[PDB]
Write a structure and sequence with these properties.
This is part of a larger assembly, with chains A and B.
Chain A (H helix, E strand, L loop, with lengths): L1 E4 L16 H16 L10 E4 L4 H4 E3 L5 H9 L9 H12 L24 E2 L41 E2 L1 E2 L24 H8 L3 E2 L4 H11 L7 E2 L27 E3 L33 E4 L17 E2 L5 H4 L10 E4 L10 E5 L18 H4 L6 H4 L8 H8 L22 H16 L47 H11 L20 H6 L10
Parallel strand pairs in A: 1-2, 1-4, 4-5, 6-7
Antiparallel strand pairs in A: 2-3, 8-9, 9-11, 10-12, 12-13
Helix pairs in contact in A: 1-6
Chain B lengths: L1 H15 L7 H15 L5 E4 L3 E3 L7 H10 L8 E3 L11 H13 L4 E3 L15 H8 L4 H10 L5 E4 L3 E4 L10 H5 L12 H7 L1 E2 L15 E2 L1 H9 L5 E4 L8 E4 L4 E4 L13 E6 L5 E6 L5
Parallel strand pairs in B: 1-5, 3-4, 6-9, 7-8, 9-11
Antiparallel strand pairs in B: 2-12, 5-6, 10-11, 12-13
Helix pairs in contact in B: 1-4, 2-4, 2-6
Classes of the chains: A alpha/beta, B alpha/beta.
The complex binds manganese (II) ion (MN) (2 copies).
């Protein structure tokens, strides 16, 4: 799923050095991105959406239940007229991407946080350089407005989601020559108000300066689409305890890269449950975070973990692997990882996995382990006392693995909270109704706005008409659509047309055809008694 | 000197009108004369009404004879061809030979423009080079035709209001003064003002956009209106796309696509049309069908 955000604002009317405006260059770049992505044999399941800088009823051009034909037709007729309302457009796009999330089961907020339930989405937000306006002045903060929150959105406290990356294109093409071609293989950043918003999600922001640089950035962007598993790392709290082959001193601490969870839907178990201590009676649930604040500690702690535990291959995208490569990729050794923010009743973090590398030393495998592996792996009334340290709802998925061996547990203590189940079906129904109402009025514009609003300065109610583009005057049916110049000739033409008594008469003077004239479409409505047997 | 050459031209025309090609020396002399004649013409040929503008022929001698039988004889009425009469046809050398003979015989009674198929890299991949190699044995007539195609004018200005051209508008061109200041004696490149003038296509896009053909851009209605308002024009005639009725109006009666090749590639089975413009700039769309063989 790819949602292209093209502003089509009035500031996108300035002409480049090639002769076309920035909007035409953006549309051409989108078309070349389409034809480049079509090369990879994986573009048979994705869906394209379009978002412009227009009113909430008119911002979306093609959303759910819209094929490629209507999407291309809407992107073709894009007009650059309006202000640069970036915040409202980003909010509308994020709400559109989060319409079918509370109904299928993604981010249920009650049963862990399953990383194998993915809904990838990439935003391009092709906008102008700077100087965004909000009908009052020029702002320099880019704060997303919060006026009408969706039902069930206060449990994340952030507009974007687990898998929602945000790339940006500014299209800073000069007007005279664009002769800046010193650095060949180098794509700098835009350094604008959208740069922090993009970096928070996990995607960079390109700075287009030349058509060659545009082609380079488009060819570099097609290689950044996969399953979205974005997790945040922190150096705390080990004081860079990497004393293995050298001495530490770094910027590879707050790594917020993605992870490629390739399927073999995705197959996996043992998710990151949450970051708080869930109580048995809690009417209000604390809001989750889109990026989990999980921290790693550099300790050997028996990296050899061999068992019949179901295996996972959530591949990690190499972005800050320099710190690992400095220590020879940690051969035959790993380092634990633990989620912060009160992972248990009374403690600060519980190691639930590690980041052991592969034998090929190519990337990090991201070995996800159970909540507390070094205890259950090595019954004398031990498991009954051990199952009290883990979160309650967490007994859900692990028991499935126990199904591979037997079934000692039951549904006696399989209860998260009596108040968490309530006020959940109503929120899901409200979200479904909102998604249906949004998908219903998605393409039907029905503007019907043509007036001059004649002010005084039949009274207080007059309004002069405006020039209608698609008027289609009926010359043979309506007599008012016949001007004075070609009146007598048109009169004789109408007379001859009425006195001819032909078959299948029409009221159009000369209606040649539409913009498209297909050969197969016209040849299908015919009959040819021939087969060419010879 | 002049009377004998005129009689030889009439004999050549009468021979070509019976599905009979000329010899090597005759085609060479005809191409030379057309080169000395077309040298005086500019990029925007000032054509005067009344005329009868046609579209693509794509090497169809029978369809060309049908067009002549429909829209009057060649010496009687004026003609304005907008390219595409050399490729995608069984009889392609005969059509261009008859056209160039009528041009060198009636230089003030017929005008022909340059199309995207009048080049050296397109005729080799569509059959014209194969036809010239098969019929004439050698590959000298094809060389002469490709050397002559560089002298064909680009566009035409009818009555100072109608702007006829094969491809269409260009993003690097804003007025006719830029078109008049182009070196048409050059192979059609893959990019530039001439490539867009010979490879453009109209649509409801609005602005510009890359064309699916591989060369030229795609303009919209606002661009056509801006080009017609900034040059005093009232219409833009073109012939580059396949239509069904023969003539198609676009951009609020600003662009007129006139495809005068009936039964394109002998697989569509459509009609064709030409636009006869009278002395008072009154247009009449004369339609026709492929003649039976
Ligand atoms: Mn053609
Ligand atoms: Mn053509």
């Amino acid at each position: 799923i790819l949602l292209f955000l093209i502003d089509t604002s009035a500031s996108m009317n300035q002409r480049s050095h090639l002769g076309t405006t920035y909007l035409d260059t953006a549309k051409g770049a989108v078309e070349t991105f389409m034809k480049l992505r079509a090369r990879d044999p994986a573009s048979r399941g994705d869906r394209y959406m379009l978002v412009t800088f227009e009113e909430p009823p008119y911002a979306i051009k093609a959303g759910w239940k819209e094929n490629h034909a209507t999407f291309m037709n809407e992107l073709k007729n894009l007009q650059a007229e309006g202000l640069t309302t970036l915040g409202q457009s980003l909010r509308t796009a994020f709400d559109l991407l989060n319409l079918n999330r509370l109904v299928t089961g993604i981010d249920n907020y009650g049963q862990g946080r399953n990383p194998f339930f993915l809904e990838p989405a990439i935003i391009i937000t092709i906008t102008d350089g700077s100087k965004l306006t909000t009908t009052s002045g020029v702002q320099d903060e880019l704060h997303l407005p919060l006026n009408s929150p969706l039902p069930g959105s206060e449990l994340t406290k952030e507009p974007f989601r687990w898998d929602q990356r945000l790339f940006a294109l500014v299209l800073r093409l000069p007007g005279t020559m664009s002769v800046e071609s010193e650095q060949l293989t180098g794509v700098p950043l835009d350094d604008s108000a959208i740069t922090p918003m993009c970096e928070v999600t996990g995607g960079r922001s390109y700075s287009v300066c030349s058509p060659r640089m545009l082609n380079q950035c488009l060819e570099s962007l097609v290689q950044k689409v996969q399953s979205g598993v974005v997790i945040n790392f922190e150096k705390a709290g080990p004081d860079p305890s990497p004393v293995e082959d050298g001495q530490p001193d770094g910027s590879q601490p707050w790594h917020s890269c993605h992870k490629l969870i390739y399927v073999r839907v995705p197959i996996g178990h043992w998710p990151v449950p949450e970051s708080f201590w869930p109580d048995q009676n809690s009417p209000t649930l604390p809001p989750r975070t889109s990026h989990p604040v999980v921290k790693f500690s550099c300790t050997d702690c028996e990296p050899m973990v061999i068992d019949k535990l179901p295996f996972d291959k959530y591949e990690l995208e190499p972005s800050p692997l320099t710190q690992f490569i400095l220590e020879r990729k940690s051969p035959q050794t790993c380092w634990q990882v633990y989620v912060s923010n009160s992972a248990k009743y009374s403690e600060l973090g519980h190691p639930f996995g590690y980041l052991k590398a592969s034998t090929a030393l190519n990337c990090v495998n991201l070995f996800v382990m159970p909540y507390n592996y070094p205890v259950l792996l090595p019954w004398r009334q031990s498991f009954e006392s051990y199952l009290k340290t883990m979160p309650p709802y967490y007994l859900g998925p692990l028991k499935k693995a126990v199904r591979m061996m037997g079934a000692p547990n039951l549904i006696a203590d399989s209860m998260e909270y009596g108040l968490s189940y309530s006020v959940i079906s109503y929120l899901k129904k409200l979200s479904q109704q909102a998604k249906i109402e949004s998908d219903r009025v998605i393409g039907s514009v029905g503007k019907k706005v043509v007036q001059e609003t004649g002010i005084k300065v039949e009274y207080t109610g007059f309004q002069v008409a405006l020039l209608n583009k698609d008027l289609k005057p009926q010359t043979f049916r309506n007599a008012y659509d016949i001007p004075r110049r070609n009146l007598l000739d048109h009169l004789t033409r109408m007379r001859s047309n009425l006195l001819k008594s032909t078959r299948r008469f029409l009221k159009g003077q000369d209606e040649d055809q539409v913009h498209s004239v297909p050969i197969a479409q016209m040849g299908n409505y015919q009959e040819y008694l021939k087969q060419v047997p010879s | 000197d002049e009377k004998v050459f005129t009689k030889e031209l009439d004999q050549w025309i009468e021979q070509l009108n019976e599905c009979k090609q000329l010899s090597e020396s005759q085609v060479k002399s005809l191409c030379e004369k057309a080169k000395e004649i077309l040298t005086k013409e500019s990029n925007v040929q000032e054509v005067r009404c009344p005329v009868t503008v046609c579209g693509d022929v794509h090497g169809q001698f029978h369809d060309l004879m049908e067009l002549f039988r429909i829209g009057g004889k060649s010496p009687d009425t004026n003609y304005l061809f907008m390219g595409d009469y050399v490729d995608r046809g069984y009889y392609s050398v005969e059509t261009v030979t008859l056209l160039v003979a009528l041009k060198v015989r009636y230089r003030e009674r017929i005008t022909i423009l340059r199309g995207n198929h009048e080049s050296r890299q397109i005729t080799q991949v569509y059959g014209f080079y194969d036809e010239c190699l098969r019929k004439y044995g050698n590959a000298n007539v094809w060389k002469y035709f490709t050397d002559l195609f560089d002298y064909l004018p680009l566009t035409a200005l009818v009555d100072g209001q109608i702007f006829c051209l094969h491809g269409g508008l260009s993003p690097s061109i804003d007025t006719l003064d830029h078109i008049r200041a182009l070196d048409r004696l050059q192979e059609v490149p893959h990019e530039g003002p001439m490539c867009d003038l010979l490879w453009s296509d109209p649509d409801d896009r609005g602005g510009w956009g890359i064309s699916p053909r591989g060369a030229g851009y795609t303009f919209g209605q606002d661009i056509s209106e801006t080009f017609n308002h900034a040059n005093g024009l009232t219409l833009v005639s073109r012939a580059h796309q396949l239509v069904m009725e023969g003539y198609n109006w676009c951009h609020d009666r600003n662009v007129v696509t006139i495809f005068s090749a009936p039964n394109y590639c002998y697989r569509c089975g459509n009609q064709a049309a030409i636009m006869e413009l009278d002395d008072t700039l009154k247009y009449s769309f004369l339609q026709f069908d492929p003649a039976p063989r």
